């Protein structure tokens, strides 16, 4: 008898038991070495997809940029970055016509946000890139460093605390002939440095076999990217076909709503087909100048300063410089030696050291390589513009109404800037095929390519969108991974509260099951008791705290009034996950116990601040 769990799919539908297809219990793959090869491969692919563009040498920097706009129309199904600005503007105009007044309201809200934006919003974020150190630093540290640098070379108009003032300081810093670093710097090198994108390899990434390159921008463009993202979020919030930034339950509601809307008019003589797919090479296919044109159309009849602020970001993103990472490592077996060659030395190096593929990539990247930074004018890098691309896709999605197609077929659906579900209605199979072909050609006209391998078409009723599986009205949210459910490592009460809050948040958001939540609570309680040696007073486990806990247990009368940190029973459950432990058991504590527990004169204190909220040593 050979056990085959996949045979369970013979009876149970795969949508009901899809959790067996997510091996999210092992360690995700990591990257050993440098990301220079991946970065060079990405740049070569991006420039190959635009090989029929216009090459123009820069003036301020001198790097040769590539312009694929208004290039030759594609002749095959291969990816192409040739996007016509007229088609994009027409799609934006049609989207505005279908939903009047969205752009003006979004602009007003974004202007209000800009006028009401502080400078500390840049402190919170991911690991950013520091140009002064040319390294990867936390956002707060990089912000402090650039503030000190702008204080050295006198530019101190951002001390008021407004982000607009910092943006103006960055604006004025680009015209300085000389720059000083706490290493004297001139103007051209500073301008090149300000456009540098630090490249590394993404770790802990699932669903892929080979590693991929991820880029991080500098500290100068953070505010402009923030403003652009705010505008895109404001636009998306008024669109019902977007997938961001709603939650899991809201996403399920959106799926049900769109399915019901499409199926509320389908008669017996009308056929409906649903396709699910992804977008291949999405990041390296969208020209930043297309985003610039879209933003320009967005800000029609607006103050000049606001539209200039919006347009600053695509201008810099159209002339970005990509770093080459760390470098490479060479080995000599006979001499038994290993050496490290930095990325800056790749400009002048013999090709006999590398293999065929590496030397081919180096040869292809050398003409675009200057001072250790390559030119990457076309295409986004990893994820900087998500919701703007979602707006671009939803424009094409909205372009599928009957008033525009003017044919017996018509399509709608949802998109999340990489995943898309498209449902098309037509009276016959030929109409379905014609609508699918029209949608594919329209997407190709803008720079959107549908991955044929990852896309499939069936009859309406079962489909998938962003790991949400819809089947006959039932949706399962399996787009996240369960956390470790362990101690945080601060103190007793803080760790208990944080664990309970994490369990509650996972239950309310990630659609965690009740039995699974109870099991997670049990595991967390076990880990907490083992870590803090706070076992129950009626147990037979010998620790250093065993004697004191036993004395406390035999001293008290109401056993349920003791906290878990003091050997008390675990009264937490599903219905009590929103109540702190101290307040939950407050009515069961003894008078002396509660008097001593929260005494304000305890030496440990200089959630409720009790004696368990001590401070460890560094």
């Amino acid at each position: 008898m050979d056990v085959n769990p996949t045979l369970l799919f013979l009876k149970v539908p795969v949508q009901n038991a899809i959790s067996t297809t997510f091996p999210y219990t092992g360690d995700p793959p990591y990257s050993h070495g440098t990301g220079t090869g991946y970065t060079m491969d990405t740049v070569n692919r991006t420039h190959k997809y635009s090989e029929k563009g216009k090459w123009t040498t820069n003036t301020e920097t001198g790097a040769p940029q590539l312009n694929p706009i208004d290039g030759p129309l594609p002749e095959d199904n291969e990816p192409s970055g040739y996007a016509q600005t007229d088609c994009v503007l027409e799609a934006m105009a049609f989207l505005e016509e279908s939903h009047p007044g969205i752009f003006e309201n979004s602009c007003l809200e974004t202007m209000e946000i800009v006028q009401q934006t502080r400078v500390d919003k840049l402190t919170q974020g991911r690991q950013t890139y520091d140009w002064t150190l040319n390294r990867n630093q936390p956002a707060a540290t990089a912000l402090a460093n650039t503030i000190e640098v702008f204080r050295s070379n006198g530019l101190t108009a951002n001390e008021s605390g407004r982000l607009i003032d910092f943006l103006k300081d960055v604006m004025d810093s680009m015209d300085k002939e000389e720059m000083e670093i706490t290493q004297r710097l001139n103007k051209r090198s500073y301008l090149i440095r300000a456009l540098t994108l630090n490249t590394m390899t993404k770790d802990a990434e699932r669903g892929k076999l080979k590693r991929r390159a991820i880029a991080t921008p500098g500290m100068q463009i953070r505010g402009f990217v923030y403003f652009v993202e705010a505008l895109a979020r404001s636009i998306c919030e008024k669109l019902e076909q977007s997938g961001l930034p709603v939650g899991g339950n809201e996403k399920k509601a959106k799926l049900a709503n769109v399915v019901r809307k499409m199926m509320t008019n389908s008669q017996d003589t009308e056929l409906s087909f649903t396709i699910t797919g992804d977008n291949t090479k999405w990041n390296e296919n969208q020209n930043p100048r297309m985003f610039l044109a879209m933003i320009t159309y967005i800000t029609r009849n607006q103050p000049e300063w606001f539209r200039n602020v919006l347009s600053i970001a695509p201008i810099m993103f159209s002339n970005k410089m990509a770093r080459l990472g760390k470098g490479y490592m060479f080995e000599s077996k006979s001499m038994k030696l290993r050496t490290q060659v930095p990325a800056e030395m790749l400009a002048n190096i013999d090709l006999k050291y590398f293999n065929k593929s590496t030397r081919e990539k180096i040869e292809k990247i050398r003409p675009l390589l200057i001072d250790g930074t390559a030119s990457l004018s076309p295409g986004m890098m990893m994820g900087m513009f998500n919701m703007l691309s979602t707006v671009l896709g939803v424009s094409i999605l909205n372009l599928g109404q009957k008033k525009y197609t003017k044919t017996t077929y018509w399509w709608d659906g949802l998109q999340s800037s990489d995943d898309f579900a498209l449902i098309v209605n037509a009276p016959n199979h030929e109409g379905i095929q014609a609508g699918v072909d029209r949608f594919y050609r329209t997407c190709k006209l803008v720079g959107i390519n549908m991955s044929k391998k990852k896309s499939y078409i069936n009859r309406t009723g079962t489909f998938e969108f962003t790991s949400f599986f819809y089947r006959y009205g039932f949706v399962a949210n399996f787009s996240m991974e369960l956390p470790s459910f362990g101690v945080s490592g601060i103190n007793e009460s803080a760790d208990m509260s944080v664990g309970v809050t994490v369990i509650k948040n996972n239950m309310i958001n990630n659609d965690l099951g009740p039995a699974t939540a109870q099991m997670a609570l049990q595991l967390f309680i076990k880990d907490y008791r083992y870590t803090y040696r706070c076992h129950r007073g009626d147990t037979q486990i010998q620790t250093r705290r065993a004697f004191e806990l036993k004395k406390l247990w035999e001293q008290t009368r109401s056993k349920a009034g003791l906290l878990v940190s003091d050997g008390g029973p675990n009264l937490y459950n599903i219905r009590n996950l929103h109540i702190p432990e101290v307040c939950l058991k407050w009515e069961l504590m003894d008078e002396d116990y509660q008097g001593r527990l929260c005494n304000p004169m305890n030496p440990f204190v200089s959630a409720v601040a009790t004696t368990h909220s001590w401070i460890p040593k560094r």
Partner: protein, 79 residues
């Protein structure tokens, strides 16, 4: 780097908690079973002394008691 492993390692030690010197007066140095509660050695950085969780449990089961009824009042969101 990893707070969980650091917390486990620190709790595996003898005197992980820091406290004011005043704790030298409210609680005895030795338990009735002979276990130590705090150490005379001084930490680096200030005059604070070292204290084991046994001292916390001892204070919980043996310590000054006062009429504390304001806690449910001032703390309302948690209560």
């Amino acid at each position: 780097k990893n707070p969980a492993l650091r917390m486990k390692w620190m709790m595996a030690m003898k005197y992980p908690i820091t406290a004011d010197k005043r704790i030298m007066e409210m609680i005895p140095e030795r338990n009735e079973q002979g276990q130590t509660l705090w150490s005379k050695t001084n930490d680096a950085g200030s005059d604070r002394v070292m204290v084991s969780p046994l001292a916390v449990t001892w204070w919980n089961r043996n310590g000054p008691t006062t009429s504390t009824v304001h806690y449910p009042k001032v703390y309302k969101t948690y209560f």
